[PDB]
């Protein structure tokens, strides 16, 4: 009935020193039934990363929509869209469905390729931007993620430390939520390399 908690899922993003991290769980269910163990919630359009939680049909639809829009952007502008610009595009696109919204919690992460500045942003389902210096959380275990992030986080972490911090935030939040977990992925993003790691986590 409540569309934001039929399928389950979480996304968290964090900034470190000259890097960002974005992570998600892998579960897709229909309420109590876990259906898929491979449902990733993080996508990329060039060097800009988008995590989407919420109703899974809208997660898929929005990914396809932003792939469409960023492909056209790139053809017309002759360059890749930057995270600050993509954040505005997400907001515009969500707000144009104001009275029949996509039931989603998007999260943008990336490094501005010109200025080198790490960037993360979060949104509500109708496009209000939350541009945070520290972290962004989204999904069914958002309360749990807020608690983990607010205690575990410290500024200017190095990529390999940030990885431990974001992974522990995700793993422990997921374990206190019935509809999140079943696997996790963590992207560590620096200006010109991106490492992706699948975490070992409890499978219940």
């Amino acid at each position: 009935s409540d569309p934001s908690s039929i399928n389950g899922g979480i996304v968290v993003a964090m900034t470190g020193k000259d890097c960002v991290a974005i992570a998600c769980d892998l579960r897709l269910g229909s309420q109590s039934l876990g259906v898929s163990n491979k449902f990733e919630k993080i996508f990329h359009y060039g060097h800009v990363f988008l995590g989407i939680t919420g109703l899974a049909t809208d997660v898929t639809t929005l990914n396809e929509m932003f792939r469409y829009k960023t492909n056209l952007y790139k053809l017309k502008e002759e360059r890749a869209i930057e995270p600050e610009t993509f954040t505005q595009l997400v907001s515009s696109s969500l707000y144009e469905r104001r009275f029949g919204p996509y039931f989603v919690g998007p999260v943008v992460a990336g490094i501005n390729s010109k200025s080198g500045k790490p960037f993360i942003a979060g949104f509500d389902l109708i496009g209000c931007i939350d541009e945070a210096k520290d972290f962004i959380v989204s999904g069914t275990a958002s309360d749990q993620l807020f608690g983990m992030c607010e205690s575990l986080y410290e500024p200017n972490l190095e990529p390999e430390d940030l990885f431990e911090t974001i992974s522990q935030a995700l793993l422990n939040a997921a374990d206190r939520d019935a509809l999140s977990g079943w696997g996790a992925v963590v992207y560590i993003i620096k200006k010109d390399e991106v490492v992706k790691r699948y975490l070992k986590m409890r499978q219940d």
Binding site: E64, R67, Y68, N71, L75
Partner: protein
């Protein structure tokens, strides 16, 4: 009423031709020549610019060669503004297909839709046709490398090598002479430039009058790359073949 001023853009002549299409083709025949050549390992697109002034900013200029998606390019002969309307339509059709099927659009399917739009302006609506001919260069995993052309009639056909715009008679004779099926990209590049060099109405063919592009499966590890040649890259490729 208004009937008095209607030129009637979508009628047959007594001979069974479409006046406006024929007259649009006449317009296209005075445009800068564009050549497409298909090899076994890639495609060449080469086009001659019509507006030379020493003061034209050439490195930020694009009148002839446009990217439709990552696998498909077009070369333009005719009205540039007309062509940009159609190009943006084709870019949108490509992305609709990708959205729908999660697969890049097959080249013929894109070509057919653009050609169907052109056809519509010849059969209904009372508007003038688009004064544009396209050479489509692209790759997909069904037919590999493909070259097509379309013109204001909305008729399209596929080719091993083809020219559009000015002096296509001369250009097609020369391509027919030196083209062979086993040919490679590097040879096709040389063929394209030689053919332009002989058909041009200018005294000499120089880097500042050209736009040039390739589509090779000559990328790192079995994928396809579009290279729109920068001015310096055309200048080098003009020396490497001994036209300068």
């Amino acid at each position: 009423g208004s009937r008095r001023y209607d030129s009637r853009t979508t009628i047959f002549s007594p001979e069974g031709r479409l006046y406006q299409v024929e007259y649009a083709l006449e317009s296209i025949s005075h445009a800068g020549t564009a050549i497409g050549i298909m090899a076994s390992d890639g495609i060449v697109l080469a086009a001659e610019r019509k507006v030379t002034s020493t003061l034209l900013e050439q490195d930020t200029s694009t009148e002839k060669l446009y990217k439709l998606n990552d696998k498909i390019a077009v070369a333009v002969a005719g009205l540039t503004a007309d062509a940009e309307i159609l190009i943006n339509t084709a870019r949108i059709h490509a992305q609709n297909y990708l959205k729908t099927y999660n697969e890049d659009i097959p080249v013929e399917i894109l070509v057919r839709r653009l050609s169907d739009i052109k056809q519509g302006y010849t059969q209904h609506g009372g508007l003038r046709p688009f004064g544009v001919s396209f050479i489509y260069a692209g790759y997909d995993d069904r037919y590999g490398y493909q070259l097509y052309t379309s013109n204001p009639s909305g008729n399209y056909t596929g080719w091993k090598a083809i020219s559009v715009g000015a002096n296509t008679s001369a250009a097609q004779t020369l391509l027919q002479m030196d083209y062979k099926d086993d040919m490679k990209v590097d040879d096709a590049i040389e063929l394209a430039l030689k053919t332009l060099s002989k058909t041009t109405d200018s005294s000499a063919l120089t880097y500042d009058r050209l736009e040039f592009a390739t589509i090779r499966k000559g990328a790192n590890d079995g994928e396809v790359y579009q290279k729109i040649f920068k001015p310096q890259e055309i200048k080098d490729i003009l020396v490497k073949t001994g036209i300068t």
